[PDB]
Amino acid sequence: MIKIAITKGRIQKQVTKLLENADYDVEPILNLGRELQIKTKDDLQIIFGKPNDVITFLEHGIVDIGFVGKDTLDENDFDDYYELLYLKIGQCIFALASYPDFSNKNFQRHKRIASKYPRVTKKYFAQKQEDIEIIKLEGSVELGPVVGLADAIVDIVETGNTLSANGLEVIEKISDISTRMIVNKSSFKFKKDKIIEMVERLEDA
Amino acid sequence: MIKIAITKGRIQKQVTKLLENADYDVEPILLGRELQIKTKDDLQIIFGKPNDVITFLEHGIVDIGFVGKDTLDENDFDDYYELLYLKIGQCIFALASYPDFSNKNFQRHKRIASKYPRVTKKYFAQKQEDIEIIKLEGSVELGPVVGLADAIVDIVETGNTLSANGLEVIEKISDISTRMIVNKSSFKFKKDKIIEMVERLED
Amino acid sequence: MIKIAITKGRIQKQVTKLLENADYDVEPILNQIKTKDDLQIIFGKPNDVITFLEHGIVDIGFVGKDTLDENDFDDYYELLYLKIGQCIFALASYPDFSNKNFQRHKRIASKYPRVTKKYFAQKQEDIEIIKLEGSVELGPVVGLADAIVDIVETGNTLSANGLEVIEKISDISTRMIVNKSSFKFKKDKIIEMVERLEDA
Amino acid sequence: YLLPEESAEMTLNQVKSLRQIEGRLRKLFSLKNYQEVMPPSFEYTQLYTALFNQEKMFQFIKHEGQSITLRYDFTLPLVRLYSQIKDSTSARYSYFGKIFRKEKRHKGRSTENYQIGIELFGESADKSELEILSLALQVIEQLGLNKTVFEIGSAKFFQRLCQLADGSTELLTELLLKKDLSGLNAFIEKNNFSKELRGLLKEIFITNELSRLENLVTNTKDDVLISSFDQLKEFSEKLSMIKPIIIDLGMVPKMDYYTDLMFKAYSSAANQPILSGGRYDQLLSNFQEEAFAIGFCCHMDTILKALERQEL
Amino acid sequence: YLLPEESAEMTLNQVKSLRQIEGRLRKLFSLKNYQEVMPPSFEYTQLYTALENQEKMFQFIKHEGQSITLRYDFTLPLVRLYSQIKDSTSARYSYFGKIFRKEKNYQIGIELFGESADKSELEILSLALQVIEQLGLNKTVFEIGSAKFFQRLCQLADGSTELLTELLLKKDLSGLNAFIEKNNFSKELRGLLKEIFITNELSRLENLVTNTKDDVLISSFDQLKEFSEKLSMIKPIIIDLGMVPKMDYYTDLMFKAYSSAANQPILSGGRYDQLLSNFQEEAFAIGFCCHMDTILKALERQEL
Amino acid sequence: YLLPEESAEMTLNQVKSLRQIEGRLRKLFSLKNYQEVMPPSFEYTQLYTALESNGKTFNQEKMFQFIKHEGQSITLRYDFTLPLVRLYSQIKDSTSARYSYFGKIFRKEKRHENYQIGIELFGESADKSELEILSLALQVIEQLGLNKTVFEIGSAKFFQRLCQLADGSTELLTELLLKKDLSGLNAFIEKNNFSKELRGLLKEIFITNELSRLENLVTNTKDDVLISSFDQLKEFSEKLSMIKPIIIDLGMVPKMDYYTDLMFKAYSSAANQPILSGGRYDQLLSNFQEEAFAIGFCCHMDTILKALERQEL
Amino acid sequence: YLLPEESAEMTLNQVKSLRQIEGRLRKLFSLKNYQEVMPPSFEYTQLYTALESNGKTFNQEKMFQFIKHEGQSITLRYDFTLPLVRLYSQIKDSTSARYSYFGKIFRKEKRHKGRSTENYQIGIELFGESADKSELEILSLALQVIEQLGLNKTVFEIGSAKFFQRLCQLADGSTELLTELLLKKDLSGLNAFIEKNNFSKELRGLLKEIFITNELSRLENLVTNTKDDVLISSFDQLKEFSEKLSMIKPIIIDLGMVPKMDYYTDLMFKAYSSAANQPILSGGRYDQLLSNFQEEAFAIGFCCHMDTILKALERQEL
Ligand SMILES: O=P(O)(O)OC[C@H]1O[C@H](OP(=O)(O)OP(=O)(O)O)[C@H](O)[C@@H]1O
Ligand SMILES: O=P(O)(O)OC[C@H]1O[C@H](OP(=O)(O)OP(=O)(O)O)[C@H](O)[C@@H]1O
Ligand SMILES: O=P(O)(O)OC[C@H]1O[C@H](OP(=O)(O)OP(=O)(O)O)[C@H](O)[C@@H]1O
């Protein structure tokens, strides 16, 4: 059968939803809590977990199909998979936020940026030709520039309600973010049928 | 003044609690969306995730910081003082797995999943046994359930999460608990206040 | 048979001589040979005799301790040791040497940099070694160096230049080196010759 | 005490089992007249960087003060060894060892990669490609893996495909590698691609059914594409008796220097390919002259891994 | 182009010949119940410390920032691997690979841990002698020596081990005389010293030893004598009392075999319990190693 | 363009600034009769790993090394004191030496050059020396130009004695003091049968320098060694008060295992690390020559400069 | 006890004296507005190997290198100019820059010889300033530094790469050879050279001479006779410098000077001490370098070889 992994966050909703409009035995709502693995009438042994954990699972072939956000697929160093479908839903994006007087200010030392995605921050400051100091934050990256920790930040801006509320504005859009459907290569080699079937269906809705 | 950072988690409760019993100005609205605040006792407090609480203390953003031993043992940072230690949480690091664990004699290498790679590694070191560490940011119990790993290294408080999956502790690793860490520099100069609060919180 | 190599220098005589005092068909007819005792002998410069022995081109090789000490080769046996001659490594210099106390490290000229180094090591004193292949006495003469480390036999070369031994480094003499593997198997003959060459 | 992440540890059984396969394979290779060669452990880094990334290879400094690197690749040294033979005859090499390359920790990645492969230089073009594909297939039958597939593709086809697609190889490449269906659609959208070319692109990404592809190809009416496809079709029919071959037109040449034929064999119990090979004359002309170079490689680490995940 | 001074290139024939021997030896070992192990290629520089120089080993830094080294030795990893066993039983390991070092290396060996004292020594001595007969070398010698004998030799030499060691290594006969001069050693001890340097004739040595009126030395020579007798039928054994322990941690028995066609030894081994003590407890550790390079070089220099 | 994580880059201003302080210090030093010496850039690894520590195995992992033509292990200047201690052994006349140095060492850092300025003093009278160095160290600090600073002094004899008295658990206590692990100390004390006095002291040295407060606690122990060691420090606190208030840290952990007794460090409020660390270490001289009085400090320019910047803001 | 061989050891005195000169030069440089900069101790070898000059100055065999964590090849400061040139590129303001440096470079030299491995240099760079103004300002400074050094008998030599280059092309484009010839002043090879070719009387007369004389009047003529604009032009630029700086110190013009570096733009110069075998100061203009990074600008400067200068200061007193 087809084993799929989904990220517990909002993304879970997006998928459960899209699965519904594709007509599936979407039943994650009923055994919602303490249960981590579930079976459907369409032969789908689904598992849930944080994004990086979804990818881990997919990497080790614990599951054939995984639904995670581009934001994580760019950050996570993993690369051995297939990004078949791409349900353009969330309007999230990677951006470089900071205080308004940012671009107007001349810095002497190197610009220290705070971020939950150091690899994207790094990658982005490379094409722009600028070596910088990356401070990792697992929580609310807005604090970096507030407390004095960092000059600017690299985070995902959806509505922009978080930045403005702190007196922060976008300096430059990095890239568009969105939920993707990644597939284990080997799984696609032999269970190519079903995987495609589902891809074609999930696309229909 | 004294700048303190606390971990948003359960620890946030223990601290705000302890501060209370210490006669310190609790502003409980701290159910209040700002990130930075101030008290009547000259305590500019900040909150966030452990690994971040530590990051703030490392860069001198705050003098005192309250985080858990579980994070202090894993986080590679070392440059701080662990003055006070409110022994509250009954958490502990352990090695959980299926009952038939110790009885099985595999010819392969037992791969353990865990949310703390460094503690899993460090522990399996003193025990003489190279292993494969699979990192899981959440619900590490799956590791053995889906077949990802043979056993795991996580924190066990009540054990209601392992039994509910058919997992049992194999060996206790070490005791865990919320600690009061202080930035060294802050301690050479604000050595007074830091101590003052340390003696009080000790009750 | 047994393959021997001898240094062309003054040592060749000591050897051809000793071989005589113990009976072996001496053949000073050259200008590679064989003897009646099965001794394919070869001649060449010390560093070359050693090189031959190293590559097992020969089993026994007769060289001077002076070269053996300088040469970085170590994989051989020093069985016999005909104590003939009286050469000695020494540290020569102008008399006013030890009395002068400069403000830096001294420079020594030598034909044997390794020995010169090794000696000045046990004496606790980092120095600048300047190599000379010919007459090392010029070192201090021309102003190139402060002192020298060379082989002093009679001392007729230093005095004639106004130099004097400042200290004896070590005793020098012709030695009989043998290739290890050769000794492992041809151990009889090699030992037989050792015991004979020893009676003199 | 313990061991470092940089080192892999095989169990006795894993050794017994690897060594077993080597035996069978050794007998197989020697029967086809393939002489084994053991390449030096160290190479001048200049040889590797010159065709990669120095960041994947373990290196350090030698006495004279140069940059030497641990065996990172098997094909090169052997290619070299073939250049040193001025005898314009065919050469059949084979190698049983490991290469050293760096990987990310705590993901379960390995640094010591045991491989077993063969190379073939100088032999006839048409004969070489066939002999290799044959051996490759035979080797796989000795491994002892239950469910396996053998995929073959053409780089010229790929390359042609690229030029036909407004020559934007940099992108299509990425598209095929991730099988980015949605990214492909968008790609087609932006430039006025032709029905035939479009219907193809969409298809090669997700299917290997001969019949289906056959038509799509001939419909493009491109000599190169139909040509490339037929070569492949042929191999499909010639080796069909041994093992059902699979044609991947959506195959992306692993190495930038692949001449044309390229292939890889997967296991249902392995995420990475157990065997990958192809022809790469280009390598040879980086020493000697133009000759036919083709040879595969068996990834033992992967193969063994599959053998275990297989029994369970 | 060219190749690093560190990279050695074997010729097809060398490989064919190397792979043949392995084949013969693999069959031999598996029959004696020796299991082959493949030690990691990388190790923590901190482990290669038990042998008592980092200048002979290839090393670099890892991601985390540590000192890793290419397999510099085979015995340790296997000894380690034996420690990782809480089951107190004997182990028979074999290894077929190479080590990485610098000077101016494919080895094939076996280790034996935990087996009985006397039985172990004999089993390895046998095995070392059976391997040599699978090699294909025409003229070879199998030497055995005793570290205890060596050590006891030194202490009796006014305990100036640092010097005698240097003397025995160079068979510096004149230096020994001088050495005997400065320290008026008893006729016996002197008589022995001069000889051990240049002869293995059992009858000759036997006497010189029993004359030393030393329990330790005579005891040690006897252990070797015995060996000489029990293995004589297999291959004439040679006792070298002038043998200098290759490793500072050899327990007592130590041996090496040489070909007339190769300067270095083709096989060297011995008992070194000391190593086991670095991890686990005290047990009997012993095993030899074949220097394939040398063995193949000897095979070639042999045919001509 | 692009540079390594191994190399540090000073800005024109930083160098200007660095070179400024040197000027002032050079003037100071030359005034106190301290000759500058420039240690070689290469050293034989055998010298470092060897002298640095003992009983254990020093670390070659922090030092840049490689091999030479002849085949030996050479290391880039890892330390300044040693080569100068050496330079002093090579002297014949048994007289006092006053060396100084202005350069950098080369060590690897595991997550992120190290420019130092220091002075060594070998041979001079015991008493006179300690006093001379502590003055000088204090004088240096006043030329640096940092606003808020503290000068700390301690005694390894006090620390060492403290450890023995504490059931000789030096391996542990050291670790406690280092982390100021108060709860760990409590637990430590609990498991043992120590006195009230010893206990009362332990708890205190960990968190205070108030002279009065400590003085008693020490005298209460009735230990000749601890009261002795403390007085010596108290004396320094009095003699040097007029210059700059001296702080006594009884909970100071000797940086080097070879420190004799007196040891000190000075910090800046704008600096996490110490801007000046020194002490007496006769032991080192032993590695070569006979027993003599060796004492000196070292200014960590990098930190000092960093302190100067993070200060202006 | 004993330190490696590839490590030089300065004597207290040597340090005191070296540290004196620095003081003097430091005061001088700061007065002329040169800001001191300290280049990193380790550089990515890729930066140093990208160069090949008119001789032997950029081979990976003279530099000490090793592997970093990520595993790349880093090297010890091998040269001061580059890093200062790089620094100048990282500027976002198109203004002149006046850099100075006081450190050492690490390169390998054979064993057992007075050859030093640790080379302490003091020099300055000048980027962006006006063309002529530049050349004059540097040449002046270079003369001023020599006056502060304290050496008794010194000579200051200047030359032209264009003159050299041009000369080469007139010599049947045989630069690979003429160069070797000029470097060894191989008089017997030059004669042979001239024999094999059909060089004009003038050109032949010039070659023969430039190898062995700097008497202005003598060269002046030989040059104008070639009737070559380039050669006369380049030569007049040097003459002009000879005249403008004559009051400070008698300049010498060496037309047989071979460009140390293959990238030298035009002006090149070096000064020698009667007490040293190597030059105490060398420099010239090399716009080319600035090209590898930022746009075309006027780059020029010199460097003082302190080891030699100190060596000369000792061999001088005796
Ligand atoms: O642009 P917006 O629509 O406002 O959304 C973006 C915000 O959401 C995420 O916060 P996270 O989930 O990490 O919670 P936190 O901000 O409370 O840490 C992210 O870190 C941004 O802060
Ligand atoms: O009460 P206990 O038995 O100590 O269980 C608590 C667990 O919850 C947390 O993990 P996570 O946030 O991933 O939630 P989980 O319980 O779903 O694993 C924590 O890391 C423990 O693993
Ligand atoms: O017997 P003495 O008077 O003490 O002389 C001894 C010196 O003479 C020889 O060298 P020589 O001067 O012949 O130079 P060479 O080595 O170049 O032949 C010999 O190598 C000593 O250096």
mmCIF file of C-alpha atoms and ligand atoms in Angstrom, chain A residues 116 138-142 155-163, chain B residues 8, ligand 1:
data_model
loop_
_atom_site.group_PDB
_atom_site.id
_atom_site.type_symbol
_atom_site.label_atom_id
_atom_site.label_comp_id
_atom_site.label_asym_id
_atom_site.label_seq_id
_atom_site.Cartn_x
_atom_site.Cartn_y
_atom_site.Cartn_z
ATOM 1 C CA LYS A 116 15.239 29.873 12.067
ATOM 2 C CA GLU A 138 14.209 28.433 17.065
ATOM 3 C CA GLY A 139 11.441 30.697 18.352
ATOM 4 C CA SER A 140 10.259 34.180 17.444
ATOM 5 C CA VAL A 141 12.915 35.592 15.159
ATOM 6 C CA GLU A 142 11.474 39.102 15.550
ATOM 7 C CA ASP A 155 12.032 34.586 8.175
ATOM 8 C CA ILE A 156 8.817 33.594 6.432
ATOM 9 C CA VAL A 157 6.395 36.463 6.045
ATOM 10 C CA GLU A 158 2.796 35.504 5.337
ATOM 11 C CA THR A 159 0.578 38.495 6.192
ATOM 12 C CA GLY A 160 3.274 40.766 7.583
ATOM 13 C CA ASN A 161 1.281 41.210 10.777
ATOM 14 C CA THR A 162 4.172 39.984 12.886
ATOM 15 C CA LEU A 163 6.742 42.378 11.512
ATOM 16 C CA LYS B 8 8.221 29.608 27.203
HETATM 17 O O1 LIG H 1 3.693 37.075 8.363
HETATM 18 P P1 LIG H 1 2.742 36.483 9.399
HETATM 19 O O2 LIG H 1 1.414 36.050 8.799
HETATM 20 O O3 LIG H 1 2.548 37.383 10.598
HETATM 21 O O4 LIG H 1 3.342 35.066 9.889
HETATM 22 C C1 LIG H 1 4.739 34.809 10.076
HETATM 23 C C2 LIG H 1 5.101 34.492 11.477
HETATM 24 O O5 LIG H 1 4.640 33.124 11.894
HETATM 25 C C3 LIG H 1 5.716 32.373 12.389
HETATM 26 O O6 LIG H 1 5.777 32.457 13.852
HETATM 27 P P2 LIG H 1 5.949 31.119 14.741
HETATM 28 O O7 LIG H 1 5.013 30.078 14.253
HETATM 29 O O8 LIG H 1 7.401 30.735 14.752
HETATM 30 O O9 LIG H 1 5.439 31.694 16.154
HETATM 31 P P3 LIG H 1 6.145 32.873 17.090
HETATM 32 O O10 LIG H 1 6.231 34.106 16.172
HETATM 33 O O11 LIG H 1 5.191 33.073 18.244
HETATM 34 O O12 LIG H 1 7.497 32.319 17.511
HETATM 35 C C4 LIG H 1 6.985 33.051 11.816
HETATM 36 O O13 LIG H 1 8.096 32.781 12.682
HETATM 37 C C5 LIG H 1 6.592 34.517 11.747
HETATM 38 O O14 LIG H 1 6.906 35.114 13.029
#
